[PDB]
Paper text:
Recently yeast genetics and biochemical studies indicated that the post-translational insertion of the TA proteins into ER membrane requires the co-operation of the Golgi ER trafficking (GET) complex which contains Get1, Get2 and Get3. Get3 (also named as Arr4) is the yeast homologue of TRC40 of mammals. Get3 can recognize and bind the TMD of the TA proteins. In this study, the crystal structures of Get3 from two yeast species, S. cerevisiae and D. hansenii suggest that Get3 may adopt two distinct conformations: an open conformation in nucleotide-free state and a closed conformation in ADP-bound state.
The crystal structure of S. cerevisiae full-length Get3 was determined to 2.3 Å resolution. The Get3 forms a homo-dimer (molecules A and B) in the crystal structure. In molecule A, residues 191 to 210 are missing and in molecule B, residues 93 to 116 are missing. One Magnesium ion can be located at the ATP-binding site in the NBD but no nucleotide molecules can be found even in the presence of ATP (or ADP) in the crystallization conditions. The two Get3 monomers are associated together primarily through a novel inter-molecular Zinc-finger motif, which was not previously revealed by Get3 sequence. In the crystal structure, one Zinc ion is coordinated by four Cys residues, C285 and C288 from molecule A and B, respectively. A large hydrophobic groove is found on the finger domain of Get3 structure that might represent the binding site for TMD of TA proteins. In monomer B of the Get3 dimer, a hydrophobic helix α9 from a symmetry-related Get3 monomer makes strong hydrophobic interactions with the putative TMD-binding groove. In the S. cerevisiae Get3, the two Get3 monomers are swung away from each other. The S. cerevisiae Get3 crystal structure represents the open conformation while the D. hansenii Get3 structure exhibits the closed conformation.
Numbering used by the authors:
A (entry chain B): 5 to 92, 117 to 351
B (entry chain A): 5 to 190, 211 to 350
Write the structure that this text describes.
Amino acid sequence: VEPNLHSLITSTTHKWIFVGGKGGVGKTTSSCSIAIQMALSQPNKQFLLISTDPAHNLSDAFGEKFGKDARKVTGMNNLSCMEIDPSALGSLLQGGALADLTGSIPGIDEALSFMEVMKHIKRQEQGEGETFDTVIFDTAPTGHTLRFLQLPNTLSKLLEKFGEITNKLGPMLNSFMGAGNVDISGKLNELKANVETIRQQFTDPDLTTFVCVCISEFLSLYETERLIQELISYDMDVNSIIVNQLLFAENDQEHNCKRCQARWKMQKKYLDQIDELYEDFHVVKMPLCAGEIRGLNNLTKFSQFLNKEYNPITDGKVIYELE
Amino acid sequence: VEPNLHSLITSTTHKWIFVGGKGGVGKTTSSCSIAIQMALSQPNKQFLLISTDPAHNLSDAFGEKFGKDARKVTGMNNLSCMEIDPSAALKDMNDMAVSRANNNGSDGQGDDLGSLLQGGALADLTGSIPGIDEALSFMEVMKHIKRQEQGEGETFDTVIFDTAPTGHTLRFLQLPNTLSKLLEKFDISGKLNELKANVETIRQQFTDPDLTTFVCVCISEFLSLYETERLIQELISYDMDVNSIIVNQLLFAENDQEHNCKRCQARWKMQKKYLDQIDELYEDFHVVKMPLCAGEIRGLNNLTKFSQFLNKEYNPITDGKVIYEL
Ligand SMILES: [Cl-]
Ligand SMILES: [Cl-]
Ligand SMILES: [Mg+2]
Ligand SMILES: [Mg+2]
Ligand code: NA
Ligand code: NA
Ligand code: NA
Ligand SMILES: [Zn+2]
């Protein structure tokens, strides 16, 4: 199992790529980098990179204004970006009943949010986009955004418990508690149907994968291990971890600084834990750069190391020149 | 609210001080430093620093061999350390309780935790009732302390609990509530009642903000911030007083050095960001900001020099040379 994302970058079967990682972990740089690498490597296919971050992280990363309308990133004719706010008559009753459910039932809020992002995609495609071959999902930093994948099971198990209890005695008691009951069954069952359809593609490892992003630090390893467990319970394919902010301190010409040297001793300790824990994962080890990486130019030079492993002995020049 | 633990260090009211923080966050160094500061500021009192870490963190921190029997740290007149393993001690006591149940087995019964473990019944309920494992484990530590307080004037005035690196140690504080419900349903119930009453007695002191407090330990990074928020919320749910956060491993990079190593400068920039977040989120807390030292900080000498910055705020302009001295 190669310490790179080369097989993903050149894959012609994947249409849905999720990228995620909590805690200032280089996630958005990684999303941008994966999108660039795939677009450069497959110039015949059209790629979309989409974010739901209210901070407009893609606009910040590329240095240009992105929005709800898909726009090509300047310098590419192959990659487009979107930034959408997914948070943004009987329908008022239908919505109010459904709003009450988002707070108490896990997966409903996430389903409605993701259904909205999918609506934005197909709208951009029909209105001369014209069709994206693969979508890179830059996942939100907060929340468990793929939780909707457990919803079809959650709410069918709830319907059976509903079916067991209601059939006790009635219809005296049934009509009393069900008085003024807004049905919302048709709106709920179509949501279940929409998820089950999405699940068919998202649980297919040839069509969909999740790339985890982390740093070589105790709490980030902890967060990564739980992220992977969450994704396994969704039956979502995960075999890629990007480890960012690595110092490779023993290498740099202009050595010294013990603070940095001690920090890399600790990073190396958790790297050995990652190597041992994730033996059959693509664990791609990415160098720290001075500042954050912004602009198409710096993003492509840095992104290359997702495809062919960074070698601190030879590639140091490239990094200390992005700086 | 001052960015130090001065009022805690000089408090003649506190009996139980908990120190905790997960992630390699300087927790052991903070426990030791709190213990040293209190013992130096209150020479007329006797202090116990106790650890429950099987890796023997206090022995490694002081460069002395500590254990089950309380020992004064060399160079100190009024600070002693203990290192025990309550889970391993409970497993041993429980195995014997089960062995006495299977055979025709009597008990000494003259109190207290030994009576709770009868038949091993309470121990195999630890999987269905949260807080039991933690209650019995903490009963083990209280037992060891009371035994160590011999008979004579060898009773400690204040105990500093260096909390274990793993688990939710103080979860037992929720027990009296979860057991009052459970038993509202509902020999075994007799043991549940003895346990509930035991924890309620602890609560009288552990929920008294004058007697008991918890010091959180973190680092200035996103995940450590949210882990600390999580810890704080946990302690609030226990009615544990918590109004102190120690932030370790701070570079203060713009000072001391100058402009050398931009990687440290970049790191310090990120630290300032979350330091600002912490300052605002926890405005009523003592937020104590502690410098990074190149290396460990081990031994009484280095630990007492470092620990002074818990009492009086580290000033990067003034105190940089002290960190170089270590
Ligand atoms: Cl997204
Ligand atoms: Cl997720
Ligand atoms: Mg990020
Ligand atoms: Mg530690
Ligand atoms: Na006996
Ligand atoms: Na302890
Ligand atoms: Na706890
Ligand atoms: Zn440095």
